[PDB]
Amino acid sequence: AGVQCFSRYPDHMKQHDFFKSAMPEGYVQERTISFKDDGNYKTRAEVKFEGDTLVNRIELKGIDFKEDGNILGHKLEYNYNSHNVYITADKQKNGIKANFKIRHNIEDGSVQLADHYQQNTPIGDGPVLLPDNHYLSTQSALSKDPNEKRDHMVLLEFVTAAGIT
């Protein structure tokens, strides 16, 4: 969910795709990710084109984590549950907001909730598309490269916009 400009918007919803409308100048994306009974991430990112390449540059700050919580204690399974991202316009910032819940699987069979609140605003001056309410349906598959000795993650994701007929 860092480069939501790669979502598939169905043709009948294309007037609701803020993310691509902000390109190439791009958008700022900010989140607060609150891990239930643990700490939080605050993130600020700028997503924009640099020539023909889509670039996502992020600063992440995490505070108030428990030293042997699920996060700093590495108690989460290496997998990822499908979910929806619920988008609404923020006319006042000429942008969008989103809210959604991520449920990480704990190795003991339980779940670690990560509440997400998100705000996006354009970097450029050109007109953008302010959407009606809708959601992004996301699926992500996490894997490893068997020849990579560095700490890493291989990700395959599919995302489709939905919720308007």
């Binding site: 891990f35 996060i71 890493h152």
Partner: protein
């Protein structure tokens, strides 16, 4: 659709760069891959360039992915 949508009709290369600080544990991640919005499809590989990531990879997917 918008003018910007025209930039996404084919495969677009992606670069991701993250600097992080979680409870004082500092780290950086670099990612590379490509997106094909026609199919809603993203393929990315991330490397922690500072050593061991001090948080689980899944907790960064919404930020990095």
């Amino acid at each position: 659709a918008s003018k910007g949508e025209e930039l996404f009709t084919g495969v677009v290369p992606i670069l991701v760069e993250l600097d992080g600080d979680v409870n004082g544990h500092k780290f950086s991640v670099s990612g590379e891959g490509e997106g094909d919005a026609t199919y809603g499809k993203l393929t990315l590989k991330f490397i922690c360039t500072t050593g061991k990531l001090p948080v689980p990879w899944p907790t960064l997917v919404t930020t990095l992915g």
